[PDB]
Design a protein around this ligand. Structure first.
Ligand code: NA
Length: 240
């Protein structure tokens, strides 16, 4: 019956997903709304307190964040957390509450067609600081570490692409959709080349990971999950 210590990423950018409210110790955003809606559908109480994770200067390392459940600093983590295979070895995720996977974004009229263009070329590649994309590109795709440039925010994405400091950026589709809604002149090249959605994570063998999956499914089936997306993530200033 004790309050679960739930870690939440202290996002410096793309704060619509989850962030600190107005520099308080309170939190808000898309993932928080999904979690609180889901908890209402759980058949037993889930007392909890949210605990911000990160330096407040840059988006946190999501691998390190999830590891804080494994080592017991957090009882759970709630946020925009990609369900990637290495993390599933050390926590139990819910079923995903939103689709996500890595895509390539570049200037309109780029010759880049997708991640296979990057693998066979020399240009620098941007990624979001703290994203699994960094490890994915180095490890799975064997892209030279020297080519990778960490970027902090959608303004930095537009600047790096415009000034040619990177040829393209690799990041998960939800961040790229928010970027393309704010900054005109860029486009996704190719399909997703990973398919890990976002989920909440609990300790290995936690019953709450399974109970929360049924609750998330309930939200999907009633249309509440779509309405929460609409609340946080539907604004766009871009056609093309
Ligand atoms: Na920005």
């Amino acid at each position: 019956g004790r309050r679960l210590r739930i870690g939440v990423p202290d996002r410096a950018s793309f704060k619509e997903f989850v962030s600190r409210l107005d520099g308080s110790n309170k939190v808000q955003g898309y993932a928080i709304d999904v979690f609180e809606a889901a908890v209402k559908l759980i058949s037993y109480p889930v007392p909890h307190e949210f605990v911000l994770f990160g330096d407040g200067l840059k988006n946190p390392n999501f691998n390190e964040f999830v590891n804080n459940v494994t080592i017991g600093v957090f009882d759970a983590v709630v946020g925009d957390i990609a369900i990637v295979t290495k993390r599933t070895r050390i926590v139990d995720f819910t079923q995903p509450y939103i689709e996500s996977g890595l895509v390539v974004v570049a200037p309109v009229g780029t010759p880049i067609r997708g991640v296979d263009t990057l693998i066979s070329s020399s240009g620098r590649v941007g990624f979001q600081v703290g994203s699994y994309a960094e490890n994915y590109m180095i490890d799975e795709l064997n892209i030279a570490r020297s080519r990778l440039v960490p970027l902090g925010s959608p303004k930095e994405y537009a600047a790096a692409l415009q000034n040619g400091t990177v040829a393209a950026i690799v990041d998960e589709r939800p961040y790229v959709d928010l970027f393309l809604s704010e900054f005109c002149g860029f486009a996704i090249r190719g399909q997703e080349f990973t398919r890990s959605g976002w989920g909440f994570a609990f300790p290995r063998d936690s019953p709450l990971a399974i109970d929360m999956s049924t609750a998330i499914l309930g939200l999907s089936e009633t249309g509440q999950l779509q309405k929460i997306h609409d609340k946080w993530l539907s604004r766009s200033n871009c056609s093309n």
